[PDB]
C-alpha cells in the first residue's frame, strides 16, 4: 500500500493482552497501523518488572544504526529508551521531568516539616 | 539563565506567565 | 488484462486543474481578516490566540510598501518578532515586489529580497515568507546606518562533544579488538552541524498555498 | 519663494507629444479592463498627456485609479506623474493634485522633489498655507527630503504655520515633529539644529502622553524610546560646536514647556522590564535641561531671532543656489524621459507590425 509521502520510523508496537502490555521495537512506515505491517523488528521492550525486578529491553543495535542511516525517524518513547541505554544522550524531557519531580518532592518535604513543626 | 533573557521571555509571554523557577535540588529529596 | 480506460477520470482531472487556475483566490481574499472577531472570512477559521495582539497593532508588509515609490524597492524592512527576539539586526533588503492589484488598498502581494539575519547577509535574493503577517516595520532612511551597524562577534563555538556512554564503550572495545592501543577519546565533530534558529526565514518558493473554497 | 525660471512651464509644454482624443484612449482602456487584460504604461501615459480641460481632469483621475488597480500598476512612469501635476496646475485643479497626492495609495502619485516644489510653491504664492502644509506632510510620509530645495520650503511652511498655531492635537504634534526632524537633520546650520530640538520635543511629548507606538506607527520614525533624550543630545552637541551654530530661544522654550508640562502633571508592554521607563527619567531630563540651558547661555550660543525670521533669511541665501541645481537635473530628466518614451513608442510599433504581417499569413 503505497502511501502519499511518509517515511520510515522506529517506534513501539503494542502487543500482549489486557493489563499485560508488551512492546515490539519495529521500523515501519509512519502511516501504517501501530500493530500492523512493519519493515523489520529491531528489538522488544517488556515494561512489567520480571521476577528479578528488571525491565528487559532488547536492542538490535547493528540494525538500528542501519535504519537511522537510511533516513528513519525515532518516536519520542524510543528516543528515551536509547537515552536510558546510553546509546543516545538523555532526552531533554527526561532531564526536565526529573527536575520537576525534584521540585515537587522538595515542596512536599517542606509541607511535611511545617506540619510536624506545628504539631 | 541571564536576567536579560528572562526579561525577553516575560515580554514575549506577558499575561501568560508562571512563577519563575530557580535551580532544582542537587539531589532527589525523600519523605522522612 | 488490458485495463479499460477511464476517460471520465482523466476528463474531470483536467477540468479541476483548469478551474483551480482560472478561479484561484487572490491574496486579498485568502489573507483578509476581521479585526473584531479575528477570523478569516475566506474560511471562517480563527487565528491562534498568540497572534491576536499583533494582528490589531502591526502592519502587513504590503501595507507599508503600498505607500512608497516603486513599492519600496531598495528599502529595509524588519519584523517586530525579530526586534523582540534578537539584538542583532534582522531585515530584508527588497529587490522585487508583485502587488495584488485586486486589493482596494494594494496591501497584499509578494516580495523578494536579500536576507540579513542576525548580522549575516545572504548571497542571493529569494522570496520572502510571512508577507501577509501583521508583523512588519519599515526602517527609516535616516536610521539605516545606525540600524544595520553590526560587528561580528567571535564564533567561539564548541568543536567536538563526547559520544554517548554506550556508543563510546563500543567504539573503544572495537579498537582493542583490532589491536589498536590508542588512548585518545572518541569525539563527535559538531562543527559541520550548524544549528539555525527556529525563526530563520524558510524557503517561500517551496511553500504551499490555500486552495480555492471561499465561504 | 521659487523664481519664475523654476516654475516656468515652457520646456514642459514643448515636449514631444502624440495627439490623441481622450475619449478614444478612455474607450481602449475600458475594453482592456473588461477583458481583464493589462494596460500598457504607454496607454496611461498618452491619456494623461492629452488632457485639455478641467472636465478631462476628472476623467483622467478615474483612469489613474483604474491603472493603479491593474496588473501593471508598478510600471507607472515618472514623466506621467510629473505631467499629471503639470496638468492640474495648468487647468486650476490644485485640489485634484492634492487629493491624489494624499491618496497616493489609491492613485500611485509619487512625485519627485522637483514636482513637490511646484505643487507646494503654488499654494505658497496664493498664501494657502493649509494646503501647503498638507504637501509637507506628504513629503515627510514619503521621506523625500533628499534635495535642499525641498528642505527649505518645508521648514518655511512649518514655521509659518506653527507661529499662528496654539492648540495641538496629538496627531498634529506627531506630524509636525516628524516634518521638523527630517529636514532638520539635513540642515547643518542654526535653523537645522533648532528644528531637530523642536521636532524631538513634540515627538517626546507624544511618546509619554500617548505611548511610543503612537510616534512611529505608520511614520518615518524609529521605534526606539527616548525622544526627549535625543532632544537634549542636540543641546550637548551645539555646546561643543563652532560658534556659527546656535539654537533659537523659541525652540528651547518649547522643550522647557514640554518638560514642565510632563513633570508637573492596547495594554501591550513593548519595553523590557529591566530597562528604565521614560516616565521615571523625567526628573533627570528636567535637571539636564536647566544645566544645558544655562551652559548654552554663558557660551552665547542662544539665538534671539525667531525661527520664521531666521528661516526667511536662510531661504534668501541658499534657495537661489538650490534652484539652479534642481533646474539642471530637471532638464536632464526631460531628455531622459524623451528617450525612454520613444523606446516605448517603437516597441509598440514593432509589435503591431509583427502582428499584421503574421496575422495576414494566418
XYZ file of C-alpha atoms in Angstrom:
728
model
C 0.000 0.000 0.000
C 1.998 2.949 -1.321
C 1.303 5.976 0.864
C 1.419 9.631 -0.156
C 4.817 10.708 1.118
C 5.580 9.431 4.590
C 8.796 7.944 5.903
C 10.176 5.108 7.994
C 10.050 5.395 11.777
C 11.487 3.299 14.593
C 8.666 3.052 17.121
C 6.943 0.804 19.656
C 4.211 -1.586 18.524
C 1.930 -2.615 21.383
C 1.380 -6.322 21.986
C 0.347 -8.515 24.889
C -3.114 -8.685 26.436
C -5.329 -6.527 28.635
C -3.337 -5.164 31.602
C -0.265 -7.039 30.261
C 1.431 -4.684 27.786
C 4.422 -5.778 25.720
C 6.152 -3.679 23.066
C 7.966 -4.724 19.904
C 10.508 -2.250 18.528
C 9.914 -2.067 14.775
C 10.906 0.008 11.778
C 7.743 0.751 9.810
C 6.117 3.326 7.572
C 4.733 6.081 9.782
C 1.335 5.830 8.062
C 0.919 2.111 8.805
C -1.238 0.950 11.727
C 0.523 0.800 15.083
C 0.475 -3.013 15.253
C 0.303 -3.750 11.522
C 2.823 -4.182 8.729
C 6.428 -3.301 9.562
C 9.728 -3.368 7.686
C 11.916 -5.034 10.322
C 11.723 -5.887 14.013
C 14.567 -4.187 15.882
C 14.004 -5.399 19.441
C 11.437 -5.606 22.203
C 10.514 -3.951 25.491
C 8.809 -5.587 28.468
C 7.568 -2.743 30.719
C 6.484 -5.034 33.567
C 9.233 -5.966 36.066
C 10.093 -9.660 35.979
C 10.864 -11.979 38.900
C 14.330 -10.400 39.209
C 12.834 -6.898 39.339
C 14.045 -5.949 35.854
C 12.554 -4.320 32.770
C 14.014 -6.204 29.808
C 14.867 -4.219 26.670
C 16.336 -5.859 23.571
C 18.031 -3.600 21.018
C 19.371 -4.760 17.656
C 21.984 -2.011 17.626
C 23.507 -3.104 14.311
C 20.160 -2.818 12.519
C 19.075 0.260 14.488
C 22.162 2.085 13.218
C 21.441 0.803 9.708
C 17.893 2.168 9.583
C 18.833 5.513 11.131
C 21.490 5.677 8.414
C 18.765 5.047 5.816
C 16.675 8.021 6.956
C 14.463 6.504 9.660
C 12.923 8.728 12.323
C 12.519 7.924 16.021
C 9.405 8.219 18.150
C 9.754 10.038 21.453
C 9.440 6.915 23.667
C 12.084 5.242 21.505
C 14.471 8.183 21.917
C 14.097 7.908 25.695
C 14.881 4.182 25.651
C 18.080 4.843 23.699
C 18.945 7.578 26.190
C 18.493 5.204 29.118
C 20.688 2.632 27.362
C 23.457 5.178 26.785
C 23.152 4.830 23.006
C 21.791 8.382 22.669
C 22.133 11.332 25.041
C 19.470 11.705 27.694
C 16.433 13.291 26.081
C 15.839 16.927 27.136
C 12.485 15.999 28.697
C 13.888 13.124 30.755
C 16.197 15.714 32.316
C 13.442 18.308 32.729
C 10.859 15.870 34.102
C 13.450 14.743 36.654
C 13.958 18.341 37.791
C 10.194 18.862 38.022
C 9.941 15.758 40.206
C 12.676 17.099 42.493
C 10.915 20.440 42.946
C 7.623 18.622 43.533
C 9.078 16.437 46.293
C 11.013 19.367 47.764
C 7.681 21.115 48.367
C 6.095 18.018 49.910
C 9.072 17.564 52.242
C 8.698 21.225 53.203
C 4.952 20.870 53.799
C 5.522 17.758 55.915
C 8.099 19.522 58.090
C 5.862 22.568 58.565
C 3.052 20.270 59.721
C 5.268 18.414 62.201
C 6.620 21.740 63.468
C 3.065 22.933 64.123
C 2.332 19.666 65.947
C 19.795 31.978 32.515
C 20.778 35.657 32.304
C 18.389 38.320 33.537
C 18.039 39.959 30.117
C 16.898 36.700 28.519
C 14.278 36.228 31.237
C 13.036 39.778 30.660
C 12.773 38.961 26.955
C 10.559 35.960 27.733
C 8.434 37.924 30.211
C 7.678 40.392 27.413
C 7.069 37.704 24.788
C 4.591 35.898 27.066
C 3.293 38.881 29.051
C -0.039 37.955 30.609
C 0.507 34.177 30.372
C 3.397 33.640 32.790
C 4.052 31.273 35.668
C 6.284 31.932 38.652
C 9.978 31.818 37.784
C 11.581 28.585 38.980
C 15.074 28.513 40.427
C 17.724 25.795 40.354
C 16.331 22.395 41.360
C 17.558 20.484 44.418
C 21.019 18.995 43.986
C 19.663 15.521 44.820
C 16.304 13.774 44.939
C 14.573 14.558 48.265
C 12.979 11.814 50.339
C 9.960 11.672 52.620
C 11.275 11.495 56.230
C -5.767 -7.927 -18.746
C -5.810 -4.616 -20.628
C -7.386 -2.229 -18.122
C -10.416 -0.491 -19.582
C -9.597 3.234 -19.930
C -11.362 5.588 -17.516
C -11.988 8.671 -19.639
C -14.269 10.461 -17.167
C -11.467 10.315 -14.595
C -8.951 11.994 -16.910
C -11.558 14.495 -18.118
C -12.539 15.536 -14.591
C -8.873 15.662 -13.574
C -8.105 18.280 -16.231
C -11.288 20.280 -15.612
C -10.475 20.524 -11.902
C -6.893 21.629 -12.550
C -8.145 24.229 -15.031
C -10.782 25.652 -12.682
C -8.182 25.861 -9.905
C -6.051 28.174 -12.076
C -8.828 30.342 -13.549
C -10.810 30.666 -10.293
C -7.807 30.788 -7.963
C -8.372 33.058 -4.943
C -6.170 36.118 -4.627
C -4.140 37.283 -1.646
C -6.766 39.924 -0.853
C -9.278 37.080 -0.393
C -7.180 34.412 1.337
C -5.359 36.719 3.749
C -8.141 39.109 4.742
C -9.085 39.202 8.419
C -11.971 40.507 10.520
C -10.280 42.535 13.254
C -13.326 42.324 15.542
C -13.644 38.524 15.600
C -10.077 37.821 14.391
C -11.272 35.316 11.795
C -10.509 34.897 8.108
C -13.771 35.410 6.159
C -12.445 33.173 3.370
C -12.610 30.056 5.565
C -14.172 31.309 8.804
C -11.223 29.913 10.769
C -9.975 31.885 13.763
C -6.348 32.873 14.196
C -4.288 31.437 17.065
C -4.620 33.349 20.317
C -0.932 34.311 20.446
C -1.362 36.308 17.209
C -4.386 38.361 18.301
C -2.451 41.252 19.851
C -0.160 41.712 16.842
C -2.998 41.428 14.311
C -4.504 44.579 15.843
C -1.250 46.552 16.231
C 1.225 45.629 13.476
C 1.112 46.082 9.709
C 1.422 43.684 6.809
C 4.408 44.147 4.523
C 2.415 45.400 1.532
C 0.598 47.854 3.807
C 3.988 49.545 4.191
C 5.194 49.148 0.602
C 1.922 50.281 -0.979
C 2.726 53.773 0.342
C 6.227 54.004 -1.162
C 7.542 54.808 -4.655
C 8.155 51.674 -6.725
C 6.618 49.768 -3.790
C 9.753 50.372 -1.742
C 12.425 48.584 -3.769
C 15.773 49.020 -2.038
C 14.274 49.795 1.372
C 14.960 47.762 4.507
C 12.073 46.043 6.298
C 12.294 44.264 9.649
C 9.786 42.353 11.762
C 8.506 43.116 15.250
C 9.078 39.489 16.260
C 12.742 39.765 15.258
C 13.163 43.068 17.105
C 11.863 41.430 20.286
C 13.782 38.161 19.937
C 17.241 39.213 18.705
C 19.572 42.103 19.489
C 21.427 41.786 16.182
C 19.905 43.452 13.095
C 17.460 41.278 11.154
C 15.913 42.680 7.988
C 15.135 42.135 4.317
C 16.532 44.299 1.523
C 13.736 44.423 -1.037
C 14.576 43.688 -4.672
C 11.229 42.813 -6.292
C 7.555 43.230 -5.385
C 4.427 41.804 -7.039
C 1.426 43.673 -5.594
C -2.078 42.220 -5.505
C -3.812 44.677 -7.828
C -7.202 43.264 -6.780
C -6.811 44.733 -3.275
C -8.523 48.097 -2.848
C -5.504 49.491 -0.961
C -2.834 47.356 -2.690
C -1.978 45.941 0.740
C -1.437 42.343 -0.432
C 1.103 40.690 -2.691
C 4.507 39.033 -2.801
C 8.039 40.312 -2.294
C 11.635 39.255 -2.903
C 14.786 40.460 -1.209
C 18.157 39.710 0.334
C 18.095 38.406 3.902
C 20.324 39.706 6.696
C 19.570 37.597 9.777
C 21.439 38.424 12.993
C 24.031 40.447 11.093
C 24.861 37.806 8.460
C 23.721 38.616 4.922
C 22.882 36.003 2.312
C 24.464 35.939 -1.134
C 21.355 35.804 -3.347
C 17.836 37.189 -3.188
C 14.807 34.963 -2.674
C 11.098 35.187 -1.963
C 10.054 36.478 1.455
C 7.792 34.410 3.694
C 5.128 35.690 6.093
C 4.417 38.690 3.865
C 0.759 38.504 4.946
C 1.604 38.523 8.671
C 0.881 41.573 10.824
C 4.477 41.930 11.928
C 6.409 44.267 9.589
C 8.085 47.633 10.134
C 9.832 49.952 7.687
C 13.335 51.132 8.598
C 13.526 54.927 8.092
C 16.147 56.203 5.672
C 17.860 58.373 8.295
C 18.125 55.290 10.552
C 19.538 52.741 8.090
C 23.176 53.394 9.010
C 22.611 53.023 12.754
C 20.167 50.135 12.304
C 22.423 48.000 10.088
C 25.607 48.724 12.064
C 26.895 45.371 13.300
C 30.229 43.949 14.452
C 30.551 40.151 14.070
C 31.264 38.542 17.422
C 33.891 35.770 17.549
C 32.241 32.433 16.748
C 33.754 30.782 19.827
C 31.608 27.667 19.487
C 32.356 24.132 20.630
C 34.032 21.894 18.052
C 33.636 18.351 19.421
C 31.466 16.606 22.007
C 31.835 13.135 23.536
C 29.943 10.083 22.386
C 27.065 8.751 24.499
C 28.279 6.323 27.187
C 27.346 3.090 25.401
C 28.437 4.198 21.922
C 31.780 5.279 23.387
C 32.349 1.920 25.086
C 31.576 0.065 21.853
C 33.915 2.248 19.783
C 36.732 1.667 22.277
C 36.034 -2.068 22.546
C 36.267 -2.289 18.755
C 39.664 -0.563 18.734
C 41.149 -3.017 21.228
C 39.718 -5.986 19.320
C 41.541 -4.814 16.180
C 44.801 -4.354 18.102
C 44.611 -0.560 18.362
C 46.060 0.614 21.687
C 45.305 4.331 21.327
C 44.093 6.144 24.443
C 42.521 9.057 22.553
C 38.904 9.707 23.477
C 36.284 9.192 20.745
C 34.737 12.536 19.840
C 31.772 13.660 17.757
C 32.512 16.509 15.354
C 29.751 19.119 15.662
C 31.443 21.851 13.607
C 29.556 20.777 10.478
C 26.257 20.762 12.419
C 25.170 24.391 12.007
C 22.076 24.992 14.147
C 19.757 27.633 12.714
C 17.295 29.469 14.972
C 13.780 28.102 14.648
C 12.613 31.542 13.445
C 15.008 31.630 10.483
C 13.105 32.580 7.287
C 12.209 29.397 5.434
C 12.083 28.964 1.656
C 8.866 30.599 0.468
C 9.310 29.090 -3.007
C 8.743 25.583 -1.609
C 5.675 26.590 0.431
C 2.123 25.647 -0.480
C -0.942 27.828 -0.866
C -4.539 27.618 0.316
C -6.828 26.106 -2.309
C -9.958 27.792 -3.600
C -13.061 27.260 -1.448
C -14.485 30.630 -0.347
C -17.081 30.583 2.420
C 9.547 81.659 -2.833
C 10.637 79.959 -6.053
C 11.745 82.034 -9.021
C 9.793 82.206 -12.268
C 12.509 80.222 -14.050
C 11.889 77.360 -11.615
C 8.095 77.449 -12.047
C 8.220 78.141 -15.796
C 6.348 75.517 -17.824
C 7.679 76.323 -21.305
C 10.134 73.433 -21.585
C 7.422 71.010 -20.451
C 4.838 72.372 -22.897
C 7.482 71.975 -25.630
C 7.708 68.216 -25.035
C 7.164 65.914 -27.998
C 3.521 64.817 -27.866
C 1.298 62.397 -29.772
C -2.113 63.948 -30.365
C -4.955 61.695 -29.223
C -8.589 62.025 -28.191
C -9.190 61.319 -24.509
C -12.468 59.592 -25.380
C -10.637 57.197 -27.711
C -7.935 56.241 -25.208
C -10.591 56.065 -22.490
C -12.528 53.564 -24.612
C -9.449 51.472 -25.410
C -8.655 51.162 -21.702
C -12.265 50.303 -20.844
C -12.213 47.381 -23.282
C -8.921 46.120 -21.844
C -10.240 46.261 -18.275
C -13.420 44.404 -19.264
C -11.295 41.607 -20.749
C -9.236 41.519 -17.514
C -6.104 42.288 -19.537
C -3.169 44.502 -18.514
C -2.949 48.069 -19.780
C 0.346 49.457 -21.033
C 2.198 52.259 -19.284
C 2.308 53.944 -22.696
C -1.500 53.992 -22.831
C -1.982 55.698 -19.462
C 0.928 57.952 -20.427
C -0.947 59.162 -23.513
C -4.242 59.552 -21.648
C -2.640 61.833 -19.056
C -0.507 63.561 -21.697
C -3.578 64.551 -23.754
C -5.643 66.318 -21.086
C -7.157 69.525 -22.440
C -9.791 70.822 -19.990
C -10.756 70.919 -16.330
C -13.512 68.435 -17.202
C -10.983 65.931 -18.562
C -9.053 66.217 -15.283
C -11.867 64.279 -13.605
C -11.898 61.623 -16.334
C -8.128 61.149 -16.137
C -8.336 60.782 -12.352
C -10.698 57.835 -12.831
C -8.158 56.034 -15.029
C -5.219 56.707 -12.718
C -7.275 54.832 -10.128
C -8.047 52.032 -12.590
C -4.401 51.744 -13.643
C -3.266 51.701 -10.010
C -5.545 48.666 -9.530
C -4.281 46.852 -12.643
C -1.571 44.197 -13.103
C 0.891 46.829 -14.405
C 0.442 49.403 -11.631
C 4.177 49.238 -10.901
C 5.055 50.498 -14.399
C 3.585 53.992 -13.982
C 6.405 56.202 -15.235
C 7.755 59.356 -13.624
C 7.004 61.650 -16.565
C 3.344 60.626 -16.292
C 3.287 61.573 -12.606
C 5.078 64.833 -13.405
C 2.652 65.571 -16.244
C -0.351 64.852 -14.015
C 0.743 67.618 -11.641
C 1.531 69.977 -14.525
C -1.959 69.463 -15.954
C -3.648 70.075 -12.599
C -1.773 73.372 -12.236
C -2.471 74.395 -15.839
C -6.261 73.994 -15.555
C -6.615 75.265 -11.967
C -7.135 71.876 -10.320
C -4.741 72.089 -7.375
C -7.420 70.463 -5.214
C -7.270 67.448 -7.540
C -3.477 67.131 -7.492
C -3.567 67.386 -3.698
C -6.358 64.803 -3.484
C -4.418 62.209 -5.489
C -1.225 63.024 -3.579
C -2.964 62.500 -0.234
C -4.449 59.262 -1.636
C -1.198 58.114 -3.247
C -2.046 54.517 -2.314
C -5.181 54.684 -4.479
C -3.621 56.607 -7.392
C 0.121 55.912 -7.245
C 1.092 59.596 -7.409
C 4.658 59.641 -6.027
C 6.150 62.917 -7.290
C 9.838 63.684 -7.414
C 11.349 66.523 -5.402
C 11.039 68.968 -8.304
C 7.337 68.197 -8.729
C 6.763 68.522 -4.975
C 8.125 72.075 -5.074
C 5.873 73.105 -7.968
C 2.766 71.942 -6.102
C 3.841 73.254 -2.695
C 5.057 76.548 -4.166
C 1.715 77.131 -5.898
C -0.072 77.075 -2.541
C 2.509 79.458 -1.065
C 2.002 82.036 -3.823
C -1.725 82.115 -3.023
C -0.917 82.155 0.725
C -2.891 78.917 1.176
C -0.678 77.533 3.921
C -3.323 74.986 4.948
C -2.864 73.063 1.696
C 0.857 73.843 1.517
C 1.139 72.106 4.892
C -0.653 69.027 3.552
C 2.032 68.796 0.866
C 4.770 68.978 3.506
C 3.170 66.127 5.450
C 3.217 64.075 2.239
C 6.876 64.889 1.579
C 7.536 63.607 5.100
C 5.468 60.430 4.745
C 7.456 59.633 1.584
C 10.780 60.736 3.136
C 11.579 62.969 0.161
C 13.821 65.494 1.950
C 16.890 64.457 -0.067
C 17.028 67.761 -2.004
C 17.999 71.017 -0.227
C 15.286 72.982 -2.038
C 12.563 70.766 -0.566
C 14.100 71.105 2.904
C 14.000 74.909 2.919
C 10.465 75.205 1.538
C 9.196 72.701 4.107
C 10.800 74.433 7.093
C 9.399 77.744 5.843
C 5.861 76.347 5.680
C 6.154 74.585 9.042
C 7.440 77.590 10.991
C 4.869 79.798 9.256
C 2.042 77.546 10.464
C 3.460 76.925 13.947
C 3.618 80.630 14.816
C -0.130 81.038 14.283
C -0.996 77.650 15.803
C -1.661 77.333 19.537
C -3.778 74.229 20.232
C -2.217 70.941 19.105
C -3.820 67.540 18.732
C -1.546 64.578 19.375
C -1.857 63.636 15.699
C -0.650 67.132 14.785
C 2.277 67.187 17.220
C 3.367 63.878 15.693
C 3.139 65.151 12.112
C 4.761 68.482 12.993
C 7.502 66.747 14.968
C 8.392 64.386 12.130
C 8.164 67.117 9.487
C 10.565 69.258 11.533
C 13.026 66.463 12.315
C 13.755 65.044 8.862
C 14.660 68.320 7.081
C 16.381 69.494 10.261
C 18.762 66.534 10.279
C 19.777 67.503 6.727
C 20.457 71.189 7.505
C 23.804 71.690 9.265
C 23.091 75.230 10.442
C 21.268 77.085 13.203
C 17.853 76.609 11.583
C 18.601 72.910 11.177
C 19.622 72.221 14.770
C 16.695 74.248 16.117
C 14.321 72.116 14.037
C 15.755 68.903 15.486
C 15.238 70.264 19.001
C 11.724 71.429 18.115
C 10.893 68.113 16.452
C 12.222 65.870 19.216
C 10.315 67.944 21.779
C 6.949 67.453 20.073
C 7.653 63.758 19.483
C 8.902 63.264 23.036
C 5.635 64.696 24.337
C 3.585 62.263 22.243
C 5.762 59.403 23.493
C 4.930 59.982 27.159
C 1.283 61.013 26.765
C 0.178 58.605 24.018
C 2.953 55.995 24.115
C 5.856 55.105 21.859
C 3.690 53.261 19.321
C 1.774 56.489 18.684
C 5.054 58.012 17.468
C 6.432 55.506 14.951
C 3.319 53.624 13.792
C 2.910 54.427 10.082
C 5.580 57.123 10.411
C 9.184 57.518 9.166
C 10.425 57.432 12.769
C 12.405 54.877 14.745
C 10.789 52.606 17.337
C 13.476 53.205 19.976
C 12.368 55.117 23.100
C 13.974 58.307 24.331
C 12.940 61.164 22.061
C 13.304 63.702 24.873
C 16.788 62.300 25.480
C 17.675 62.897 21.826
C 16.440 66.481 22.212
C 18.991 67.049 24.978
C 21.771 65.455 22.917
C 21.307 68.298 20.425
C 21.903 70.876 23.161
C 25.052 68.964 24.120
C 26.289 68.907 20.520
C 25.611 72.614 19.964
C 27.612 73.469 23.099
C 30.658 71.696 21.594
C 30.445 73.016 18.022
C 31.731 76.070 16.142
C 30.308 79.419 17.201
C 28.453 79.658 13.877
C 25.891 77.116 15.108
C 23.367 78.407 17.650
C 19.926 77.499 18.986
C 16.823 79.676 18.879
C 15.142 80.632 22.136
C 11.728 79.669 20.747
C 12.892 76.069 20.327
C 14.357 75.912 23.839
C 11.127 77.337 25.261
C 9.151 74.575 23.536
C 11.285 71.869 25.146
C 11.134 73.615 28.517
C 7.350 73.854 28.315
C 7.106 70.175 27.350
C 9.317 69.069 30.242
C 7.398 71.216 32.734
C 4.007 70.060 31.443
C 5.106 66.425 31.725
C 6.785 66.672 35.133
C 4.119 68.909 36.682
C 1.266 66.544 35.785
C -3.635 48.045 23.592
C -2.115 47.402 27.030
C 0.847 45.601 25.451
C 4.149 46.467 27.132
C 6.837 46.843 24.463
C 9.824 47.682 26.699
C 11.815 45.186 28.750
C 11.059 45.284 32.469
C 14.773 45.637 33.278
C 15.024 48.896 31.311
C 14.182 52.262 32.848
C 10.950 53.783 31.573
C 10.847 57.313 30.190
C 8.305 58.441 32.794
C 10.792 57.612 35.557
C 13.587 59.569 33.830
C 11.705 62.880 33.628
C 13.301 64.446 36.750
C 16.709 63.628 35.267
C 15.760 65.269 31.962
C 14.473 68.432 33.638
C 17.754 68.725 35.542
C 19.857 68.188 32.413
C 17.784 70.819 30.600
C 18.349 73.544 33.197
C 22.063 72.693 33.261
C 22.424 72.794 29.474
C 20.095 75.795 29.197
C 22.455 77.825 31.387
C 25.578 76.395 29.738
C 24.376 77.498 26.293
C 23.526 80.979 27.603
C 27.004 81.555 29.048
C 28.604 80.411 25.776
C 26.432 82.855 23.821
C 25.040 80.003 21.710
C 21.377 81.063 22.032
C 19.740 82.980 19.178
C 17.150 85.670 19.891
C 15.715 85.844 16.367
C 12.589 83.829 15.692
C 12.539 80.613 13.708
C 10.323 82.056 10.969
C 12.519 85.155 10.748
C 15.732 83.117 10.879
C 14.412 80.696 8.253
C 13.354 83.510 5.913
C 16.971 84.686 5.939
C 18.269 81.188 5.181
C 15.874 80.884 2.228
C 17.037 84.121 0.600
C 20.657 82.980 0.917
C 20.607 79.352 -0.250
C 17.330 78.869 -2.143
C 18.582 80.749 -5.209
C 21.558 78.387 -5.442
C 19.396 75.284 -4.974
C 17.018 76.250 -7.788
C 19.945 76.293 -10.222
C 20.889 72.707 -9.361
C 17.295 71.456 -9.439
C 16.628 73.096 -12.807
C 19.745 71.353 -14.125
C 18.507 67.921 -13.034
C 15.025 68.714 -14.355
C 16.388 69.310 -17.858
C 18.347 66.053 -17.674
C 15.162 64.190 -16.740
C 13.189 65.712 -19.620
C 15.812 64.461 -22.077
C 15.977 61.018 -20.469
C 12.175 60.919 -20.300
C 12.101 61.711 -24.024
C 14.450 58.840 -24.887
C 12.615 56.330 -22.692
C 9.257 57.375 -24.153
C 10.448 56.958 -27.746
C 11.554 53.398 -26.988
C 8.025 52.635 -25.781
C 6.506 54.031 -28.979
C 8.897 51.991 -31.128
C 8.360 48.743 -29.220
C 4.609 49.169 -29.713
C 5.035 49.859 -33.433
C 7.184 46.769 -33.999
C 4.633 44.636 -32.146
C 1.790 45.936 -34.315
C 3.871 45.495 -37.474
C 4.919 41.986 -36.442
C 1.279 41.149 -35.705
C -0.043 42.490 -39.016
C 2.465 40.506 -41.081
C 1.919 37.293 -39.112
C -1.844 37.771 -38.754
C -2.279 38.185 -42.515
C -0.344 34.971 -43.176
C -2.517 33.123 -40.647
